[PDB]
Curated annotation (Swiss-Prot), chains A, B:
Physiological role: Required for thylakoid formation.
Annotated knockout phenotype: Essential, it cannot be completely disrupted. Cells with very low levels of protein have no ordered thylakoids, are barely green and are non-photosynthetic.
Family indicated by similarity: Belongs to the PspA/Vipp/IM30 family.
Full protein segment contained here: 109 to 161 of 267
Localisation: Cell inner membrane
Descriptive protein name: Membrane-associated protein Vipp1
Length: 53, 53
C-alpha cells in the first residue's frame, strides 16, 4: 500500500515531466522556423532594399 | 489550435517570401537582357558612328 502510493506520486511526476518536454520540443522547432523566416526576410530587405550592389 | 494558427501565420509569410523571390528573378533576367541590348546598341553606335578605324 505504501510502495504503491509512493509509486503513484512518482508516476504523476513522470507524466508531468513528459508533457513539459513535449511542449519544449514544439516550441523549439517553431522558433527555429521563425528565426529562419526572419533571416530570409532580412535578405529580401537587402536585395529589394535601398541602393548598393 | 495554438500551434495551428501559429503555423498558418508562418505559412502566410512563406507564401509572401516565395512571391517576392519570383518577382526578383523576373526582374533580374529582364535587366540582364536590357543591359545586353544597351551594350549591343553602343557597339552599333561605334561602327555606324563618326570617323575612326
Ligand atoms: N542608400 C541606402 N538606402 C537604404 N538602405 C541602404 C542604403 N545603403 C545600404 N543600405 C542597407 O539597407 C538597410 C536599410 O535600413 P532599414 O532600416 O532596413 O530601412 P528602413 O529604415 O527604411 O526600414 C541598412 O541596413 C543598410 O545596410
Ligand atoms: N570624329 C568623331 N566623330 C564622332 N564620334 C567619334 C569621332 N571619333 C571618335 N568618336 C567616338 O564616337 C562617339 C561619338 O559620341 P556620341 O555622344 O555617341 O555622339 P552623339 O553625341 O552625336 O550621339 C564617341 O564616344 C567617340 O568615342
Amino acid at each position: 500500500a505504501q510502495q504503491r502510493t509512493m509509486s503513484e506520486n512518482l508516476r504523476r511526476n513522470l507524466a508531468a515531466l513528459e508533457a513539459k518536454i513535449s511542449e519544449a520540443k514544439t516550441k523549439k522547432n517553431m522558433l527555429q522556423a521563425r528565426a529562419k523566416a526572419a533571416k530570409a526576410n532580412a535578405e529580401l530587405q537587402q536585395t529589394l532594399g535601398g541602393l548598393g550592389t
